[PDB]
Paper text:
As a part of efforts to develop new therapeutics and diagnostics for melioidosis, the Seattle Structural Genomics Center for Infectious Disease (SSGCID) has determined the crystal structure of betaine aldehyde dehydrogenase ([name]) from [name] (BpBADH). [name] catalyzes the irreversible oxidation of betaine aldehyde to the osmoprotectant betaine and is being investigated as a drug target for drug-resistant bacteria, notably Pseudomonas aeruginosa, because its inhibition blocks choline catabolism and leads to the accumulation of the highly toxic betaine aldehyde. The structure also contains 21 helices, 21 strands, four β-hairpins, four β-bulges and 25 helix–helix interactions. BpBADH has a prototypical [name] topology and shares considerable structure and sequence similarity with the ortholog from P. aeruginosa (PaBADH). The 489 amino acids in each monomer fold as 20.4% β-strand, 39.3% α-helix, 2.5% 310-helix and 37.8% loops, forming six β-α-β motifs that contain five β-sheets (four mixed and one antiparallel).
Author numbering:
A (entry chain A), B (entry chain A), C (entry chain A), D (entry chain A): 2 to 490
Write the structure that this text describes.
């Protein structure tokens, strides 16, 4: 294989699993075997929890500034190793090197950097009740937290979940997607090199059954999961039924992008293209229902198709590429099935729509950037998250209509509008039922900005100050300075 | 029956159920039939949700100060009707009238009053990213929330769950315990009289199957449950598996009270007695493992037994009573079984230990205030929440020992210490794994103080500013004022 | 006189001064003597401070909710007495009854109501340093605060200064403007009737020399002053030189209103008219430099002049009036001098410009709503706050030009823009150097919104949560639980 | 001289003054001339302001994380250069090298480090008013701030004032004490080397007349001063009278240390010694009134005198020294005058009391660690800040007495108690009128802990999150999305 035998990371070192099982990860651009990975057993998860409990104690006994400095050093190492990590991530995911070099590690490190600086600002409250009694709260570490990653942003998700957990004094056991197991181990090495105590970031490997081992474990105080809605429901159910864990869920969406008749149409078309085809369409927040007001529909669609024809589909290892293969053959089968469904249900195929099989593309999982026009709300491609490069374009007449149809979904992750008008921009966004809202842009996710889903697109949030607060638990302390007045007298 | 036929409260009025089923509520002091209550059907819950969705829209369209004033009026009505509500609550629960007159409605109204004044202070954030772009958040209502009450504090729990929900602009569908269905309807009437729109506080009735209808309903954004750990696990699992609802769980405990050798022993004994026998021992936060340092053990136990002998066991309708019956025969059977278990496992019976059956007591569910000495950590009465008036007293030698044994539990609701020493008071409390901690007192739960469980004693919190914040969901809005830089160029 | 002999309010009652001096207040619409008012002596201010210190102790010893309820009752009394107070305020100020009935008491009570509900939410922090030591803060009352009011909003300013002071547990000694001494006494009566302890709101009377007695007094912890810039500088200097008091200053302005070429011009003209002639032009935040982009200048000026001709100038006691006299003859002389200055320096007189002297107007201090066109940045009427009904209209070519000229002032109180464009609205406001900024509106001052000046227009803020916080002082408490390590060993 | 000709630091380089004036700084241990320093003229201050305005614009245009990284680099350079800076600071101040090596730069860098990490967490608010209108605030830089340092902690004060100013996007012009002008220039060099733009930290030099130039300058938005009460009053008066600047004042104190009869007396004596003789008694927060309860008075005084006799008085360049000379001959004359006053007014001289003149001590400004017993509240040494190594010990009988006498002062900087009792520790501290309160310790000033004075000991605060917030000014923005309803219709 390219990268050899891979295993677990427990107690500050790589470690053999005890399952007797392995799984393979491939390069989806070529079919090359990247690595054979040992799968964690139930005993291994138990050992990862004992290791995390030990490391968490040492980590939490440090001052907040000592934790800050160690996380700041981890940032330095991620910045130094950006290009090496970006190549590994490109191989494992199939995403273009132009993306992994500029986004995945950069923004992963950005969030660790943000929380490293905030580690000193976790404060409880104090409030008097009367001269003789007052309350103060402590914001204590939860303890051992579990993170379960997705394959579309492997190391970035590892960074985003581990950063607030560690900055708040927790340990984290992280399980990457079995589709993309490699880069999370490099993050574990970097945390150790930066000075993170043994066990504070452990990595276990395997499929959803290993995820279930984490979600069910009685020694884990909180589980944070990123993935599909239906898997997230099983994770949350098990996390609650097993031991009443706290939970964060970052799930899929069918996010609406509303292009109004007073939108900058060049800006709108750029936005729609970014919102549908970045990372080969494999982004939870993608604006995959593109609502366009009738009077600008033709002019907008023309601009969209012109930009789509300029997408550079190619080998993800080529820095000129800005669109590569999907992450797996299962992904490809699903996306092509949706394209078949769209065609059969009468949507108009305006661009793409087929697997690329010429020359080197045959050895990979390549689906062309695809655009459907004249879509209807009752179509499968409009109702369901595809998680691939398929834009559905829908005409509308009025603002109330667009808002009603945008909201008529059980998803609620993101939403966005394009309009030059002050009143319309804010009033439309205020009525959209989504946790992540963009005006005249799309896709940026600053470390300061809490992100998460309404409805079935998630529970809780990531990033922002609030997420650091939610990696602590509140202890309320009432101090009685006066005489205790007997109740039974 | 005493109080007649009772039913549902939907859309601003009492309303018939459509199940064809009823259930009875009794006075546990006398066995008198209090009421026959119609049980909500699945259709009724659907109707309660449609009604709540309609009312929530009108409620949220008001200004925060308009909501504040209406909730302040509800407070006035609760204060005026304190004694009538207290009698009803005494009849339904069996708790002494001296408690329901002074605590249940008073502190229920206290929390509504607190949140009414804070309804105007729910603020998002704003943060710039660069001159051309900034983020602001909205804290929007969740929508329709569900509350599921327990029978030990029926109207107080209805107040504590509905107050932050309504103050944040939500509607709530509330289901009281089938053991104590009556007082929640009076709160619904008061909210309507105060000006709360139809559907903003609906009441449905029935057993845990009606609770499951709420927990599973796709139109409900959040479920808040108070009850036993094992039921809470089923609620949270269903709330997550059905539609990824937000959840709050306030569950049971086995909370430790640590009496140190430098405790004020009079104060410690008063505290231990309050912490074990208020509300006939039916309080989730009760300090039911009483750890006492060896050098003061004998002097402390003597003081405890002297106070226990002065408890006034009697009819709860008599204002001289400060200890009445348990809430049900099922409660009595369970508690007596635990007393049997304690005796068989070798704990020493120091007080009580038997059902009272003389004179009027035979018609009720009365168990004497019970104290066990010389207890061991491996005993059932020490390991498991009894939810009845049974104190377990445990000797210890050292501070580290007491803290280790106090923490060696899967419960984590409350904890407390009694000591005159500054350093010891805070350092011991900081090491105890509980969300609710008391120093030289017990049991007070100010509206300012967030309360909830560590470990399997809960998820999330009630009361405090934080709980108002957690009845909103965060919408992040990024405003791009500059040119959108194309990603696909 | 109309309202008779008036005096001081100290220790919960009206009280004679000991200066041997009085001053008269008149109705500026008629010249009628309203009242003869006893002026406080230095001994009286000393007595007001001793009285406030005593009342503050009782007030602060109450719970926050007890203070909340008493302030909520004060709100009820202000709402009930709205019309009686509005007539008194109209007589004393000359402002139209249509304003005092709808604005002055309503919004004064609004801010007391807001802070009454927030009185329970004043919280310190807690932060650990290490296992053996932690910090908590207390937010303690400042003690005795001084408020010095202006004559344009007498009772509203009394409400806005006293509300956060009292809600935070302080006492306040308030001195109204000698021009408008009457309504502050009614507020003192209402606070007493609502349950505020004696001395918690005292009223002293007189000119700026009595204000200086307050600013210099060593027993006063904070002074809050609203008035002109040059007086504010003397107040702040004396407040600091005497005893290092905390200070709030709400001073005058020359606030710019920028009407862009893509403004709704009807909206812009309505805004400009409100921003210049409400309260007969006597508002610190008025938009008295009206910048209009050249391409819409003529159309905008036409709309402005049409609205100005529809202003109903009349007796302020007539509810049909929406523009009455200025507050004093000194005001009139000053404003007419500015009109003379504008004419002499070459500004074009487009409306008004003269004293009204026909019929009843001769007995009052009436100056017509005045508009100058073709103004220049170097004109006196453009550079200096007039505090009267004089709009200066200035043409501009570019957005950078308007922003540069709007900012080229030592004032910095308010600013505003009118534009339909999303990007322009926010980017222009972000560059304007003012504390109070309005987009597509003007003049609303919600209780939630902190208001105050940049540059020489003020220090500190009023309203918003932040102002409640700034009526407390921070006490930091470090608790050492471990052994103190000797420094000298 | 030892360190040569020194001058100003403006626009990223050392720069000649234009006053034609210099002043000398000496080593107070030897009388050696350390440097001849050019004094800034009025033109130089004007130039420093123009330079700061230019640098502030570039600094504020960076992202918060870009500012964070540059300040983090400044921290690295301060840590690397700790020993070189410590020697310079020892030479200039006379404080022991054991102090400057371990405290001055360490804790100065600590606060820069703290604020560097928090630079990303400065957030405004957002609050809706109604569906059609909402408010958001911006926390904008003040602009150009002035810092005026004291000679007892020259570089630490430069760090503590410049850190929150720069982290919030301001520039600062700093003037060190003319007694200790050297180390502030090294900080300016370090900021430049770390990447701080030219003009963002400028240094001007001279006596109080140069301080007055800063306090009066119309281009400076805020002045922060640390020094004596009487100078602080003049600074605040001029800062307000000139242009209504915001102000922070950290002034002197006469802080009480209360040793109760249940204090750990070893701990109390260590604390009292630290609280009186660190930095040769030249600390604003020193506990210079030591109240001791009568029953432990003799035992406590014995312990104090035993520790005082073990103080190592010596050359500050010797690392074995922990007590050196005072900072100047003016300091020495003043302190000796107070010792004379204490003796004449009848206080009992228990230790020290004289200038050391043997051997090398004759060439320095050495006063022995001095202790007075049997002091009275009416003595000059008890009433007035000495700012030298003179402890006044006062007996008391009751807790109320100690608290009353501790509070009977116009100072209010710090206070502290020593007691093993939980109730007494908190209840006594809650009643003491001081901003900085210590329980069973003294002198630690964590970056998290806001510090400042009550009464005439200061205005505003330093350190803590609150101080970062107070280096911004609030801009409130109301966005009207609906139709503007005409007021004049
Ligand atoms: Na792979
Ligand atoms: Na019942
Ligand atoms: Na008047
Ligand atoms: Na010197």
């Amino acid at each position: 294989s390219v990268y050899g035998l891979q295993r677990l990371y427990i107690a500050g070192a790589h470690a053999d699993a005890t399952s007797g099982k392995t799984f393979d990860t491939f390069d989806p651009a070529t079919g090359e075997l990247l690595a054979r990975v040992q799968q964690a057993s139930a005993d291994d998860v138990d050992r990862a929890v004992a290791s995390a409990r030990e490391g968490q104690r040492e980590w939490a006994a440090m001052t907040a500034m000592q934790r800050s400095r160690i996380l700041r050093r981890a940032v330095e190492l991620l910045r130094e190793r950006n290009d090496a990590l970006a190549e590994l991530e490109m191989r494992d995911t199939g995403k273009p090197i132009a993306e992994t070099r500029a986004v995945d590690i950069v923004t992963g490190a950005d969030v660790i950097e943000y929380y490293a600086g905030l580690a000193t600002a976790i404060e409880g409250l104090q409030v008097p009740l009367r001269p003789e009694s007052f309350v103060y709260t402590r914001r204590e570490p939860l303890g051992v937290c579990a993170g379960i990653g997705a394959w579309n942003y492997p190391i970035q998700i590892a960074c985003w979940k581990s950063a607030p957990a560690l900055a708040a004094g927790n340990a984290m056991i992280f399980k990457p997607s079995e589709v993309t197991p490699l880069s999370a181990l490099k993050l574990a090495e970097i945390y150790t090199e930066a000075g993170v105590p043994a066990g504070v970031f452990n990595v276990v490997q395997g499929d959803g059954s290993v995820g279930a081992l984490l979600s069910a474990h009685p020694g884990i105080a909180k589980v944070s999961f990123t993935g599909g809605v239906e898997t997230g429901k099983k994770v949350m159910s098990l996390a609650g039924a097993s031991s009443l864990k706290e939970v964060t869920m970052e799930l899929g969406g069918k996010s609406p992008l509303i292009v109004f008749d007073d939108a900058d149409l060049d800006r709108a078309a750029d936005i729609a293209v970014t919102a549908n085809f970045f990372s080969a369409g494999q982004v939870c927040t993608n604006g995959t229902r593109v609502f366009v007001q009738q009077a600008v529909k033709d002019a907008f669609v023309e601009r969209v198709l012109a930009r789509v024809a300029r997408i550079r589909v190619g080998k993800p290892s080529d820095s000129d590429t800005n669109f590569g293969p999907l992450a797996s053959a299962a992904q490809l089968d699903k996306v092509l099935g949706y394209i078949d469904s769209g065609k059969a249900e009468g949507a108009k195929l305006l661009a793409g729509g087929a697997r690329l099989v010429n020359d080197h593309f045959a050895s990979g999982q390549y689906v062309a950037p695809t655009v459907f026009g004249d879509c209807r709300d009752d179509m499968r491609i409009v109702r369901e998250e595809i998680f691939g490069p398929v834009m559905s374009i829908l005409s509308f007449e009025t603002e109330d209509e667009a808002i009603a149809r945008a909201n008529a979904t059980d998803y609620g992750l993101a939403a966005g509008v394009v309009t030059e008008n002050l009143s319309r921009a804010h009033r439309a966004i205020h009525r959209l039922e989504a946790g992540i809202c963009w005006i005249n842009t799309w896709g940026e996710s600053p470390a300061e900005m809490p992100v998460g889903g309404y409805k079935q697109s998630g529970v809780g949030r990531e990033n922002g100050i609030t997420t650091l607060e939610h990696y602590t638990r509140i202890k309320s302390v009432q101090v009685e300075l006066g005489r205790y007045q007997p109740v039974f007298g």
